[PDB]
Amino acid sequence: DDWRCARSMHEFSAKDIDGHMVNLDKYRGFVCIVTNVASQCGKTEVNYTQLVDLHARYAECGLRILLFPCNQFGKQEPGSNEEIKEFLAGYNFKGDAFSKICVNGDDAHPLWKWMKIQPKGKGILGNAIKWNFTKFLIDKNGCVVKRYGPMEEPLVIEKDLPHYF
């Protein structure tokens, strides 16, 4: 339960959607959008298409996309990691997908615990993730620099990206 003392996303690890453990220090030097996702959500179409767009236009500038499936909201991510991976392929997603996790509660993955208590990752009255497609912008040093709620479309993030490239 050391997660509170971390200073950077780069001190965490998580299994990708294929089951291999990934060390998030691989993202040092890159700007990262970290988001909890779901396949059967009214937000799903606009979030995936805009995130794929952003990653296409800004990958060379250093932008990376980290997707964490999460079934805690309306049971809107009920499939296996396998089916999520094919779902993402239908959007032509080229970023990094991770295995399904929890984002709220004591079982929440330690990275999401850490993001929620950061000075720029705290939420509107309470820090809990409120629904699918909350987005955290992470800088090249692995620090949370902004948090966007489920209603904020990914293109809203675009105006904040140049400052970190």
Side-chain angles (χ1 to χ4, degrees):
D1 202 59
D2 222 291
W3 59 263
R4 255 196 212 260
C5 297
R7 300 158 180 168
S8 169
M9 177 185 92
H10 306 149
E11 313 173 34
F12 293 89
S13 294
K15 323 175 145 123
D16 67 22
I17 197 137
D18 298 315
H20 315 350
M21 180 75 36
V22 175
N23 191 326
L24 300 193
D25 57 20
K26 68 177 308 201
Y27 293 103
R28 185 182 289 110
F30 296 90
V31 188
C32 288
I33 294 164
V34 184
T35 184
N36 61 302
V37 304
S39 301
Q40 295 175 9
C41 182
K43 294 161 174 60
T44 292
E45 179 83 5
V46 81
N47 273 270
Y48 282 144
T49 60
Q50 284 185 8
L51 287 163
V52 166
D53 177 38
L54 280 177
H55 189 217
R57 292 189 278 141
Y58 291 110
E60 298 103 326
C61 310
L63 180 68
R64 295 293 178 274
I65 306 271
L66 289 65
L67 305 188
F68 288 92
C70 182
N71 201 28
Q72 292 184 297
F73 306 100
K75 282 190 209 133
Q76 300 186 334
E77 188 75 299
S80 68
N81 289 328
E82 232 161 42
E83 329 175 291
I84 294 150
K85 207 212 195 164
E86 323 159 325
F87 189 85
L88 294 173
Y91 283 96
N92 191 35
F93 178 68
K94 288 317 331 173
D96 308 314
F98 293 85
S99 287
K100 193 201 304 218
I101 52 176
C102 282
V103 299
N104 288 333
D106 312 309
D107 270 90
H109 176 296
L111 169 67
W112 280 81
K113 294 189 173 176
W114 177 83
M115 296 208 279
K116 280 180 320 183
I117 67 151
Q118 309 289 140
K120 315 278 199 153
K122 316 184 102 95
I124 298 302
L125 282 308
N127 294 333
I129 310 306
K130 303 292 155 12
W131 205 250
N132 313 290
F133 301 104
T134 303
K135 303 98 188 169
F136 294 88
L137 184 62
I138 312 276
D139 66 16
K140 72 204 181 103
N141 301 307
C143 318
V144 173
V145 292
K146 205 155 171 187
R147 170 177 176 164
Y148 311 82
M151 271 338 282
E152 295 177 73
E153 298 175 1
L155 283 188
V156 152
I157 306 173
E158 184 170 0
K159 84 180 56 80
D160 303 320
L161 289 176
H163 176 66
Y164 300 101
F165 290 151

PDB file of all heavy atoms in Angstrom, residues 25-49:
ATOM      1  N   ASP A  25       7.366   3.574 -16.272  1.00  0.00           N
ATOM      2  CA  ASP A  25       8.464   4.494 -16.557  1.00  0.00           C
ATOM      3  C   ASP A  25       8.822   4.524 -18.042  1.00  0.00           C
ATOM      4  O   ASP A  25       9.521   5.448 -18.474  1.00  0.00           O
ATOM      5  CB  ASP A  25       9.707   4.162 -15.715  1.00  0.00           C
ATOM      6  CG  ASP A  25      10.194   2.743 -15.906  1.00  0.00           C
ATOM      7  OD1 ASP A  25       9.860   2.114 -16.927  1.00  0.00           O
ATOM      8  OD2 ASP A  25      10.947   2.258 -15.042  1.00  0.00           O
ATOM      9  N   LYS A  26       8.330   3.566 -18.841  1.00  0.00           N
ATOM     10  CA  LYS A  26       8.500   3.649 -20.290  1.00  0.00           C
ATOM     11  C   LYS A  26       7.944   4.947 -20.860  1.00  0.00           C
ATOM     12  O   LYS A  26       8.320   5.338 -21.973  1.00  0.00           O
ATOM     13  CB  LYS A  26       7.832   2.456 -20.975  1.00  0.00           C
ATOM     14  CG  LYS A  26       6.324   2.465 -20.882  1.00  0.00           C
ATOM     15  CD  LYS A  26       5.661   1.302 -21.638  1.00  0.00           C
ATOM     16  CE  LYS A  26       6.111   1.166 -23.079  1.00  0.00           C
ATOM     17  NZ  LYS A  26       5.084   0.393 -23.838  1.00  0.00           N
ATOM     18  N   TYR A  27       7.075   5.640 -20.119  1.00  0.00           N
ATOM     19  CA  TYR A  27       6.433   6.850 -20.618  1.00  0.00           C
ATOM     20  C   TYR A  27       7.201   8.122 -20.302  1.00  0.00           C
ATOM     21  O   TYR A  27       6.766   9.205 -20.712  1.00  0.00           O
ATOM     22  CB  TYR A  27       5.001   6.936 -20.084  1.00  0.00           C
ATOM     23  CG  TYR A  27       4.150   5.835 -20.664  1.00  0.00           C
ATOM     24  CD1 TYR A  27       3.820   4.711 -19.917  1.00  0.00           C
ATOM     25  CD2 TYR A  27       3.715   5.896 -21.987  1.00  0.00           C
ATOM     26  CE1 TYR A  27       3.058   3.685 -20.464  1.00  0.00           C
ATOM     27  CE2 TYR A  27       2.960   4.869 -22.543  1.00  0.00           C
ATOM     28  CZ  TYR A  27       2.633   3.773 -21.773  1.00  0.00           C
ATOM     29  OH  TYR A  27       1.878   2.757 -22.316  1.00  0.00           O
ATOM     30  N   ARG A  28       8.346   8.021 -19.625  1.00  0.00           N
ATOM     31  CA  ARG A  28       9.150   9.205 -19.348  1.00  0.00           C
ATOM     32  C   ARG A  28       9.517   9.935 -20.633  1.00  0.00           C
ATOM     33  O   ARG A  28       9.978   9.327 -21.604  1.00  0.00           O
ATOM     34  CB  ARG A  28      10.412   8.811 -18.582  1.00  0.00           C
ATOM     35  CG  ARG A  28      11.259  10.003 -18.145  1.00  0.00           C
ATOM     36  CD  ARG A  28      12.514   9.515 -17.447  1.00  0.00           C
ATOM     37  NE  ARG A  28      12.170   8.950 -16.146  1.00  0.00           N
ATOM     38  CZ  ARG A  28      12.231   7.657 -15.842  1.00  0.00           C
ATOM     39  NH1 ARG A  28      12.634   6.753 -16.724  1.00  0.00           N
ATOM     40  NH2 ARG A  28      11.880   7.261 -14.620  1.00  0.00           N
ATOM     41  N   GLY A  29       9.312  11.251 -20.638  1.00  0.00           N
ATOM     42  CA  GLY A  29       9.508  12.052 -21.819  1.00  0.00           C
ATOM     43  C   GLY A  29       8.273  12.218 -22.682  1.00  0.00           C
ATOM     44  O   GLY A  29       8.235  13.132 -23.515  1.00  0.00           O
ATOM     45  N   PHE A  30       7.249  11.389 -22.476  1.00  0.00           N
ATOM     46  CA  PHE A  30       6.007  11.450 -23.232  1.00  0.00           C
ATOM     47  C   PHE A  30       4.898  12.100 -22.413  1.00  0.00           C
ATOM     48  O   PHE A  30       4.862  11.994 -21.183  1.00  0.00           O
ATOM     49  CB  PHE A  30       5.568  10.047 -23.637  1.00  0.00           C
ATOM     50  CG  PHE A  30       6.509   9.380 -24.571  1.00  0.00           C
ATOM     51  CD1 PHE A  30       7.547   8.607 -24.081  1.00  0.00           C
ATOM     52  CD2 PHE A  30       6.379   9.548 -25.939  1.00  0.00           C
ATOM     53  CE1 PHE A  30       8.428   8.000 -24.930  1.00  0.00           C
ATOM     54  CE2 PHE A  30       7.255   8.935 -26.797  1.00  0.00           C
ATOM     55  CZ  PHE A  30       8.284   8.160 -26.293  1.00  0.00           C
ATOM     56  N   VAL A  31       4.001  12.786 -23.118  1.00  0.00           N
ATOM     57  CA  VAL A  31       2.761  13.309 -22.559  1.00  0.00           C
ATOM     58  C   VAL A  31       1.680  12.254 -22.731  1.00  0.00           C
ATOM     59  O   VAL A  31       1.513  11.692 -23.824  1.00  0.00           O
ATOM     60  CB  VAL A  31       2.359  14.615 -23.255  1.00  0.00           C
ATOM     61  CG1 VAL A  31       1.171  15.256 -22.547  1.00  0.00           C
ATOM     62  CG2 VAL A  31       3.531  15.562 -23.279  1.00  0.00           C
ATOM     63  N   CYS A  32       0.928  11.996 -21.668  1.00  0.00           N
ATOM     64  CA  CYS A  32       0.063  10.828 -21.625  1.00  0.00           C
ATOM     65  C   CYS A  32      -1.345  11.284 -21.268  1.00  0.00           C
ATOM     66  O   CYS A  32      -1.526  12.091 -20.348  1.00  0.00           O
ATOM     67  CB  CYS A  32       0.552   9.845 -20.580  1.00  0.00           C
ATOM     68  SG  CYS A  32       2.047   8.964 -21.016  1.00  0.00           S
ATOM     69  N   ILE A  33      -2.332  10.772 -21.988  1.00  0.00           N
ATOM     70  CA  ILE A  33      -3.723  10.834 -21.561  1.00  0.00           C
ATOM     71  C   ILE A  33      -4.101   9.455 -21.023  1.00  0.00           C
ATOM     72  O   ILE A  33      -4.059   8.458 -21.754  1.00  0.00           O
ATOM     73  CB  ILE A  33      -4.644  11.267 -22.708  1.00  0.00           C
ATOM     74  CG1 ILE A  33      -4.333  12.719 -23.099  1.00  0.00           C
ATOM     75  CG2 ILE A  33      -6.108  11.071 -22.300  1.00  0.00           C
ATOM     76  CD1 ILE A  33      -4.906  13.140 -24.453  1.00  0.00           C
ATOM     77  N   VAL A  34      -4.460   9.402 -19.743  1.00  0.00           N
ATOM     78  CA  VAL A  34      -4.838   8.178 -19.041  1.00  0.00           C
ATOM     79  C   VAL A  34      -6.344   8.228 -18.804  1.00  0.00           C
ATOM     80  O   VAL A  34      -6.854   9.223 -18.273  1.00  0.00           O
ATOM     81  CB  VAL A  34      -4.068   8.058 -17.706  1.00  0.00           C
ATOM     82  CG1 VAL A  34      -4.375   6.748 -17.019  1.00  0.00           C
ATOM     83  CG2 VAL A  34      -2.573   8.200 -17.948  1.00  0.00           C
ATOM     84  N   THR A  35      -7.066   7.175 -19.198  1.00  0.00           N
ATOM     85  CA  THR A  35      -8.519   7.278 -19.129  1.00  0.00           C
ATOM     86  C   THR A  35      -9.130   5.913 -18.832  1.00  0.00           C
ATOM     87  O   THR A  35      -8.585   4.873 -19.207  1.00  0.00           O
ATOM     88  CB  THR A  35      -9.078   7.918 -20.426  1.00  0.00           C
ATOM     89  OG1 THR A  35     -10.497   8.114 -20.325  1.00  0.00           O
ATOM     90  CG2 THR A  35      -8.752   7.097 -21.657  1.00  0.00           C
ATOM     91  N   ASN A  36     -10.232   5.922 -18.085  1.00  0.00           N
ATOM     92  CA  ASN A  36     -10.964   4.697 -17.812  1.00  0.00           C
ATOM     93  C   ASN A  36     -12.069   4.567 -18.848  1.00  0.00           C
ATOM     94  O   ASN A  36     -12.808   5.526 -19.109  1.00  0.00           O
ATOM     95  CB  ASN A  36     -11.546   4.683 -16.403  1.00  0.00           C
ATOM     96  CG  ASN A  36     -12.519   5.809 -16.156  1.00  0.00           C
ATOM     97  OD1 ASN A  36     -12.183   6.982 -16.289  1.00  0.00           O
ATOM     98  ND2 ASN A  36     -13.746   5.452 -15.793  1.00  0.00           N
ATOM     99  N   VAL A  37     -12.172   3.398 -19.454  1.00  0.00           N
ATOM    100  CA  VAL A  37     -12.993   3.266 -20.652  1.00  0.00           C
ATOM    101  C   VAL A  37     -14.052   2.187 -20.448  1.00  0.00           C
ATOM    102  O   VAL A  37     -14.039   1.438 -19.473  1.00  0.00           O
ATOM    103  CB  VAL A  37     -12.148   2.979 -21.913  1.00  0.00           C
ATOM    104  CG1 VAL A  37     -11.095   4.067 -22.112  1.00  0.00           C
ATOM    105  CG2 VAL A  37     -11.524   1.596 -21.842  1.00  0.00           C
ATOM    106  N   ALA A  38     -14.978   2.123 -21.405  1.00  0.00           N
ATOM    107  CA  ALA A  38     -16.067   1.166 -21.386  1.00  0.00           C
ATOM    108  C   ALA A  38     -16.610   1.070 -22.805  1.00  0.00           C
ATOM    109  O   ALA A  38     -16.583   2.047 -23.557  1.00  0.00           O
ATOM    110  CB  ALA A  38     -17.164   1.588 -20.399  1.00  0.00           C
ATOM    111  N   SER A  39     -17.096  -0.113 -23.168  1.00  0.00           N
ATOM    112  CA  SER A  39     -17.535  -0.335 -24.540  1.00  0.00           C
ATOM    113  C   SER A  39     -19.002  -0.005 -24.765  1.00  0.00           C
ATOM    114  O   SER A  39     -19.386   0.319 -25.896  1.00  0.00           O
ATOM    115  CB  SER A  39     -17.267  -1.784 -24.931  1.00  0.00           C
ATOM    116  OG  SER A  39     -15.885  -2.075 -24.802  1.00  0.00           O
ATOM    117  N   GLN A  40     -19.824  -0.054 -23.724  1.00  0.00           N
ATOM    118  CA  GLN A  40     -21.267   0.053 -23.890  1.00  0.00           C
ATOM    119  C   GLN A  40     -21.787   1.312 -23.219  1.00  0.00           C
ATOM    120  O   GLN A  40     -22.757   1.277 -22.455  1.00  0.00           O
ATOM    121  CB  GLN A  40     -21.927  -1.204 -23.332  1.00  0.00           C
ATOM    122  CG  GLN A  40     -21.524  -2.427 -24.139  1.00  0.00           C
ATOM    123  CD  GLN A  40     -22.046  -3.732 -23.580  1.00  0.00           C
ATOM    124  OE1 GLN A  40     -22.864  -3.751 -22.661  1.00  0.00           O
ATOM    125  NE2 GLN A  40     -21.574  -4.838 -24.141  1.00  0.00           N
ATOM    126  N   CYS A  41     -21.139   2.432 -23.513  1.00  0.00           N
ATOM    127  CA  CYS A  41     -21.419   3.710 -22.885  1.00  0.00           C
ATOM    128  C   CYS A  41     -21.834   4.704 -23.955  1.00  0.00           C
ATOM    129  O   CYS A  41     -21.312   4.677 -25.074  1.00  0.00           O
ATOM    130  CB  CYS A  41     -20.176   4.220 -22.133  1.00  0.00           C
ATOM    131  SG  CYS A  41     -20.389   5.763 -21.245  1.00  0.00           S
ATOM    132  N   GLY A  42     -22.782   5.576 -23.615  1.00  0.00           N
ATOM    133  CA  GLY A  42     -23.173   6.619 -24.542  1.00  0.00           C
ATOM    134  C   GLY A  42     -22.039   7.544 -24.925  1.00  0.00           C
ATOM    135  O   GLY A  42     -22.101   8.193 -25.975  1.00  0.00           O
ATOM    136  N   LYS A  43     -21.001   7.620 -24.096  1.00  0.00           N
ATOM    137  CA  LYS A  43     -19.824   8.423 -24.383  1.00  0.00           C
ATOM    138  C   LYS A  43     -18.812   7.688 -25.257  1.00  0.00           C
ATOM    139  O   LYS A  43     -17.886   8.328 -25.775  1.00  0.00           O
ATOM    140  CB  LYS A  43     -19.185   8.847 -23.052  1.00  0.00           C
ATOM    141  CG  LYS A  43     -20.069   9.787 -22.254  1.00  0.00           C
ATOM    142  CD  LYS A  43     -19.676   9.829 -20.775  1.00  0.00           C
ATOM    143  CE  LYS A  43     -20.496  10.898 -20.062  1.00  0.00           C
ATOM    144  NZ  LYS A  43     -21.963  10.618 -20.145  1.00  0.00           N
ATOM    145  N   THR A  44     -18.990   6.375 -25.443  1.00  0.00           N
ATOM    146  CA  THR A  44     -17.936   5.535 -26.006  1.00  0.00           C
ATOM    147  C   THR A  44     -17.511   6.027 -27.383  1.00  0.00           C
ATOM    148  O   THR A  44     -16.316   6.179 -27.658  1.00  0.00           O
ATOM    149  CB  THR A  44     -18.408   4.079 -26.087  1.00  0.00           C
ATOM    150  OG1 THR A  44     -18.552   3.533 -24.770  1.00  0.00           O
ATOM    151  CG2 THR A  44     -17.409   3.229 -26.852  1.00  0.00           C
ATOM    152  N   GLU A  45     -18.480   6.282 -28.269  1.00  0.00           N
ATOM    153  CA  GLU A  45     -18.134   6.589 -29.653  1.00  0.00           C
ATOM    154  C   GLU A  45     -17.329   7.879 -29.739  1.00  0.00           C
ATOM    155  O   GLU A  45     -16.272   7.920 -30.377  1.00  0.00           O
ATOM    156  CB  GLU A  45     -19.399   6.681 -30.506  1.00  0.00           C
ATOM    157  CG  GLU A  45     -19.150   7.034 -31.977  1.00  0.00           C
ATOM    158  CD  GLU A  45     -18.771   5.822 -32.813  1.00  0.00           C
ATOM    159  OE1 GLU A  45     -18.787   4.692 -32.267  1.00  0.00           O
ATOM    160  OE2 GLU A  45     -18.466   5.990 -34.019  1.00  0.00           O
ATOM    161  N   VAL A  46     -17.798   8.943 -29.087  1.00  0.00           N
ATOM    162  CA  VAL A  46     -17.079  10.208 -29.222  1.00  0.00           C
ATOM    163  C   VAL A  46     -15.712  10.148 -28.552  1.00  0.00           C
ATOM    164  O   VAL A  46     -14.759  10.800 -29.014  1.00  0.00           O
ATOM    165  CB  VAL A  46     -17.901  11.388 -28.678  1.00  0.00           C
ATOM    166  CG1 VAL A  46     -17.796  11.475 -27.167  1.00  0.00           C
ATOM    167  CG2 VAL A  46     -17.377  12.673 -29.279  1.00  0.00           C
ATOM    168  N   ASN A  47     -15.573   9.368 -27.475  1.00  0.00           N
ATOM    169  CA  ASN A  47     -14.289   9.368 -26.791  1.00  0.00           C
ATOM    170  C   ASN A  47     -13.264   8.574 -27.582  1.00  0.00           C
ATOM    171  O   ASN A  47     -12.136   9.036 -27.783  1.00  0.00           O
ATOM    172  CB  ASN A  47     -14.431   8.820 -25.371  1.00  0.00           C
ATOM    173  CG  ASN A  47     -14.806   9.896 -24.392  1.00  0.00           C
ATOM    174  OD1 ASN A  47     -13.939  10.536 -23.806  1.00  0.00           O
ATOM    175  ND2 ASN A  47     -16.094  10.128 -24.227  1.00  0.00           N
ATOM    176  N   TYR A  48     -13.644   7.392 -28.061  1.00  0.00           N
ATOM    177  CA  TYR A  48     -12.676   6.601 -28.818  1.00  0.00           C
ATOM    178  C   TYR A  48     -12.283   7.282 -30.125  1.00  0.00           C
ATOM    179  O   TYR A  48     -11.098   7.294 -30.489  1.00  0.00           O
ATOM    180  CB  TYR A  48     -13.195   5.191 -29.081  1.00  0.00           C
ATOM    181  CG  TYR A  48     -13.081   4.272 -27.886  1.00  0.00           C
ATOM    182  CD1 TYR A  48     -14.043   3.319 -27.627  1.00  0.00           C
ATOM    183  CD2 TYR A  48     -11.958   4.295 -27.075  1.00  0.00           C
ATOM    184  CE1 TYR A  48     -13.923   2.457 -26.548  1.00  0.00           C
ATOM    185  CE2 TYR A  48     -11.841   3.451 -25.973  1.00  0.00           C
ATOM    186  CZ  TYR A  48     -12.822   2.527 -25.734  1.00  0.00           C
ATOM    187  OH  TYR A  48     -12.722   1.657 -24.681  1.00  0.00           O
ATOM    188  N   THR A  49     -13.243   7.849 -30.858  1.00  0.00           N
ATOM    189  CA  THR A  49     -12.867   8.400 -32.158  1.00  0.00           C
ATOM    190  C   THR A  49     -11.983   9.634 -31.981  1.00  0.00           C
ATOM    191  O   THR A  49     -11.014   9.825 -32.729  1.00  0.00           O
ATOM    192  CB  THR A  49     -14.109   8.709 -33.001  1.00  0.00           C
ATOM    193  OG1 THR A  49     -14.926   9.663 -32.324  1.00  0.00           O
ATOM    194  CG2 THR A  49     -14.940   7.456 -33.234  1.00  0.00           C
TER     195      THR A  49
END
